[PDB]
């Protein structure tokens, strides 16, 4: 939930921050300087992905033979349906007893 | 068109290339340092490469301008999202995973993959892959006849999420409907009924045409979703956790045996018929409430002078 | 001959395929619809198909074209009449 | 950079709680 | 016949969160849950020489439970590379039941193992972690110890090379055998 | 939808030896 | 198939595609020329080798940048879609639809009682007088 979508958008930002100073990089190294020094830095940040590869490594790995998360879950959808077609049934038999109503008068 | 100037241009650079080996076909003896053109050379040098850093960084602020909108995360950003919203995903290729039910349904055996595309408002597009059409259950009671025989003429937001959820809804439509087909065959004699290939009918008494159908693309609604909840109830049912200790992954009204002595009562409480009759006997109670009805309005259309007799339902 | 030969053909090919659906779909009732109820069937390699009714006055029907008229749909057969 | 020998990783116990799980005797 | 094949693992204290994060995705139950119960070892054998365990618990969460006394001996040592854990044999029984009967059989009460962790199921095989806490009378390891139990008849130990690969399958968690 | 798993394994079978009987 | 296996590949092959990009934009870097070894073209082997290394770093920097987003997509995939083993998101979803149920369970269940006060009020107010 949260701490997986956090996760995601960590490794996303640093990919996004990767290419951001792969290319800040080639753009000081390519023409002009100490701050092509901090581009040094830019393959540090591929090392950080090489840790994430590594969190990747030693990660869960629950059996990395078939797929976890067994059952969608579904049930709870299916009874929602069942609750909504309730309600509109419930509304169509208003409108009737509505209509019914108005002839009346 | 391009391909064959490029390879008219490939074609020259070889011819070159070769005349030049065969030429040659570097080299000091035993007996560019102009300082005038090297500056040149290295200032187109520098330029072809901020060219190039220049055309990356324009594709990777191309790339970061598409990943900023949330609107066409196709790039596996959506995919993850449906992931995290929709059931897990055995990736032989690129997706799997179908509703396959074999955690939560307990039906009819089917697997496989289902939906794997990437490609284009701008959405992926999962195909729905197989029944691919509605299928329901129409009920009504209007001047039934039992006489029957013929053939089945029926007289009736995320587009790819509410079209996966339809044919997840069929397919245990179809589950559903094979269970209580064979359940009609292998019942006893309990009652007789009649099975077709997509019409069932029962008669557990005269004037009990219950007309229950499957329909598909090739009262009225609240009895069909009462046999979805039960039959649901049945497999989740299927699926109470046992509270097991050394290793009892059954049910506690087993062990409630043990020390509660209950001669039949875990005999009734163990299992019982359902499915098909307990339909059949809930359309009994609607028939029978319905002639109630009937001898009431009878008993105040004819009765009108005697004394009106009033009644209340329950609650 | 164009006429007669063509129509030999779609017609022994239309058949086979409606005899090959007929197994098939019998099968999958056995499978899917019916465990024992009409689980009795027994036909030839082709181009004829035959199954039996409940066992214990048990009956068999049978359908084939047997190439002697080529106006027979079916020839559905069975020795007890109606 | 060339001081980097090999990043090892660390992970859970189990040599060490083995032979203190607990037994009949 | 029921014969176990229960291997004994053990995993840290420290190692929970993603373990139970993983249990839960791979298989752990339908909304699974804990358990809390006292343990008690019953030793009476003067000419057999072996104390007959029987884990008379009482599930204080649940209301009524049945005291699941299991009783384990005769360790196969068949060495078909699997755990081949001794044979067992669970009966269910009423309050008190354990307790007059080890009054009038005669046993005592050998030791105390309180123990509480969560609860796991599979198709057929069964595992389970917890700790125990050595705690007093009224009421020592402190470590989760993670358990793969399959009880069922002898049959063919076809099950048996199954659960060795279930138990590869969650080899990044722990690499559970048997004991000596 | 175009893979032979279906009744199509044996179909063309059929057809095959329909032929080569008709030919 | 060898899930730990390939993506220990796929990082081994990245780690190369960034080791080789770096080499080869540190060998551009070193493009001094002060020897003067050409002696049959000194002026044309010369701007030829310029124009070879810098088409050598401009494809060293797209082979790197090529094989970052390759890389990116690849841990994309095996991380998230893959083995998203904090599931949750689903038990989330599972509180979340399992409340709205409830609301509308209760919704429903009141429109019921307010509808059977209202018919034993109407049916009352009807049988006391027959036509």
Same mark, same amino acid.
């Given at each position: ?5 956090? #996760? ?98 | ?228 909840? #039960? ?85 | ?82 | ?25 | ?180 | ?23 | ?131």
């Amino acid at each position: 939930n949260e701490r997986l979508r956090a #996760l995601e958008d960590i490794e996303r930002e640093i990919g996004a921050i990767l290419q951001n100073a792969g290319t800040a990089i080639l753009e000081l190294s390519k023409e002009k300087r100490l701050l092509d020094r901090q581009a040094a830095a830019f393959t540090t940040s591929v090392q950080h992905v090489e840790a994430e590869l590594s969190a990747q490594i030693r990660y869960l790995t629950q059996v990395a033979t078939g797929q976890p998360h067994e059952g969608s879950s579904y049930s709870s959808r299916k009874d929602c349906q069942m609750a909504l077609k309730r309600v509109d049934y419930a509304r169509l038999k208003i409108s009737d007893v509505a209509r019914t109503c108005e002839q009346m008068l | 068109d391009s391909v064959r100037n490029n390879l008219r241009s490939a074609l020259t650079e070889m011819c070159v290339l070769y005349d030049v080996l065969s030429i040659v076909r570097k080299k000091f003896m035993t007996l560019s340092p102009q300082t005038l053109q090297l500056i040149s050379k290295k200032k187109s040098l520098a330029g072809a490469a901020q060219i190039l850093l220049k055309g990356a960084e324009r594709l990777t602020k191309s790339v970061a301008e598409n990943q900023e909108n949330k609107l066409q995360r196709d790039f596996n950003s959506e995919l993850l999202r449906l992931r995290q919203h929709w059931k897990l995903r055995k990736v032989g290729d690129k997706i799997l995973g179908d509703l396959s039910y074999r955690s939560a349904g307990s039906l009819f055996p089917h697997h496989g993959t289902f939906e794997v595309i990437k490609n284009t408002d701008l959405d992926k597009k999962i195909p729905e892959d197989d029944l691919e059409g509605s299928a329901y259950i129409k009920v009504s009671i209007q001047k039934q006849a039992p006489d029957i025989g013929d053939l089945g003429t029926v007289n009736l937001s995320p587009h790819w999420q509410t079209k996966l959820e339809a044919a997840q809804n069929v397919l245990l439509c179809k589950e559903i409907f094979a269970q209580l087909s064979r359940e009609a065959v292998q019942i006893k004699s309990q009652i007789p009924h009649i099975v077709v290939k997509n019409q069932i009918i029962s008669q557990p008494f005269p004037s009990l045409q219950l007309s229950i159908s499957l329909c598909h693309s090739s009262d009225h609604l609240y009895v069909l979703e009462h046999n979805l909840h #039960l039959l649901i109830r049945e497999f989740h049912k299927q699926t109470v956790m046992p509270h097991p200790a050394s290793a009892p992954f059954g049910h506690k009204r087993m062990r409630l045996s043990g020390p509660q002595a209950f001669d039949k009562n875990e005999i009734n409480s163990i299992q019982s018929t359902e499915g098909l009759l307990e339909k059949i006997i809930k359309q009994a109670k609607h028939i029978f409430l319905r002639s109630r009805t009937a001898a009431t309005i009878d008993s105040l259309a004819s009765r009108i002078e005697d004394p009106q007799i009033q009644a209340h339902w329950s609650n | 001959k164009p006429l007669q030969d063509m129509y030999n053909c779609l017609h022994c090919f239309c058949l086979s395929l409606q005899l090959e659906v007929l197994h098939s779909q019998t099968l999958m009732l056995i499978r899917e619809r019916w465990g024992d109820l009409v689980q009795v069937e027994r036909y030839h390699a082709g181009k004829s198909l035959s199954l039996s009714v409940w066992n214990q006055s048990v009956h068999k029907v049978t359908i084939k074209i047997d190439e002697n008229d080529v106006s027979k749909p079916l020839q559905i057969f069975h020795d007890p009449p109606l | 950079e060339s001081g980097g020998l090999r990043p090892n990783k660390q992970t859970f116990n189990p040599g060490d709680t083995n032979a203190l799980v607990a037994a009949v005797a | 016949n029921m014969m176990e094949y229960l291997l004994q693992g053990s995993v840290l204290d420290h190692s929970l969160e993603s373990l139970i994060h993983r249990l839960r995705g791979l298989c752990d139950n339908m909304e699974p849950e804990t358990f809390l119960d006292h343990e008690m070892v019953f030793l009476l054998k003067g000419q057999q020489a072996s104390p007959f365990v029987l884990r008379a618990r009482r599930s204080m969460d649940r209301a009524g439970a049945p005291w699941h006394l299991r009783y384990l001996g005769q360790p196969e040592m068949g060495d078909k590379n699997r755990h081949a854990l001794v044979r067992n044999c669970v009966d269910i029984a009423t309050s008190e039941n354990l307790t007059d009967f080890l009054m009038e059989m005669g046993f005592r009460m050998d030791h105390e193992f309180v123990a509480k962790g969560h609860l796991f199921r599979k198709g057929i095989m069964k595992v389970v972690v917890y700790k125990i806490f050595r705690i007093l009378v009224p009421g020592l390891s402190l470590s989760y110890l993670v358990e793969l139990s399959v009880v069922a008849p002898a049959g063919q130990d076809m099950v048996s090379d199954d659960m060795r690969n279930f138990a590869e399958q969650l080899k990044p968690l722990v690499h559970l055998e048997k004991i000596d | 939808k175009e893979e032979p798993s279906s009744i199509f394994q044996r179909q063309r079978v059929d057809a095959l030896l329909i032929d080569l009987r008709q030919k | 198939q060898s899930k730990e296996t390939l993506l220990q590949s796929y990082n081994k092959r990245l780690k190369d595609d960034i080791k080789s990009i770096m080499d080869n934009f540190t060998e551009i870097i070193k493009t001094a020329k002060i020897e003067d070894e050409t002696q049959v073209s000194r002026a044309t082997q010369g701007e030829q080798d310029n124009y070879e290394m810098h088409v050598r770093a401009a494809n060293i920097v797209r082979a790197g940048e090529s094989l970052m987003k390759l890389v990116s997509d690849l841990k994309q995939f095996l991380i998230l879609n893959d083995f998203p083993s904090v599931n949750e998101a689903i038990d989330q979803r599972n509180q979340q639809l399992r409340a709205l149920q409830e609301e509308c369970d209760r919704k429903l269940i009141t429109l019921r009682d307010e509808v059977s006060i209202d018919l034993y009020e109407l049916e009352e107010e009807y049988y006391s007088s027959s036509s």
